[PDB]
Structure formats: C-alpha cells, structure tokens
Amino acid sequence: MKIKRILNHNAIVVKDQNEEKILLGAGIAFNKKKNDIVDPSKIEKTFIRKDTPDY
Amino acid sequence: MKIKRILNHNAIVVKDQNEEKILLGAGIAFNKKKNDIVDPSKIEKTFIRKDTPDY
C-alpha cells in the first residue's frame, strides 16, 4: 500500500490493486511519506472508492 | 450525506446507509460544517470502507 496523496497527518490517499484507496490512521502521515508503504500499525481505517454497484 | 468528521478543507468522514464514507472534494469543508449535508457540486471523490470481501 503506497501513499499517492496526503489528506492530513492521519488520512492519506493510497492506491491498491483494485483502485485508489484512503488510509485514515492517527499519525499515519507521521513516520512515512508520499510513495512510501503505509504503516500497518498506524492503519486505523481503510476506505475504497465505490467501483461498481451491482455490475 | 452528512459530515461525521473532517479530514481537511476537502476530505471529510461522512456516513451513508451502507456505513461510514469519505468525501474528498477540493473546498468540501468550505461552504459546509459537521453534521451538514455534503455539497454535491463539491463532491470530487466518494470513498467507502471495505465492508465485506465476498460474503
């Protein structure tokens, strides 16, 4: 899980195999940087954009 | 779509019928507040936490 963007010191826009994701972790931005792998101990909430409804 | 949390001036943690969501919109925080409906013209990216994989 890399960091494609930065929302704040906890939320960041990441990207997974499926598509773009969002990593919300208190202090996630701290101890990491853009393009760096996301720290799993800091992973508090993983969000993914709705790709498809039923299809 | 209400605003349960605020990530920055564009990203905010919202909540839909399915579960918690994330609204990433440049200026989304501006022209709105916590618990207020999210402006659709500002909606740039909607993210939802992975509820279930296959089940």
Curated annotation (Swiss-Prot), chains A, B:
Function statement: In the presence of sucrose, SacY is activated and prevents premature termination of transcription by binding to a RNA-antiterminator (RAT) sequence (partially overlapping with the terminator sequence) located upstream of the sacB gene. Formation of the SacY-RAT complex prevents alternative formation of the terminator, allowing transcription of the sacB gene. In the absence of sucrose, inhibition of SacY activity by SacX leads to termination of transcription.
Annotated protein name in UniProt: Levansucrase and sucrase synthesis operon antiterminator
Record family assignment: Belongs to the transcriptional antiterminator BglG family.
Chain residue ranges for the region called RNA-binding: 1-55
Organism: Bacillus subtilis (strain 168)
Modified how: Phosphorylated by HPr (PtsH).
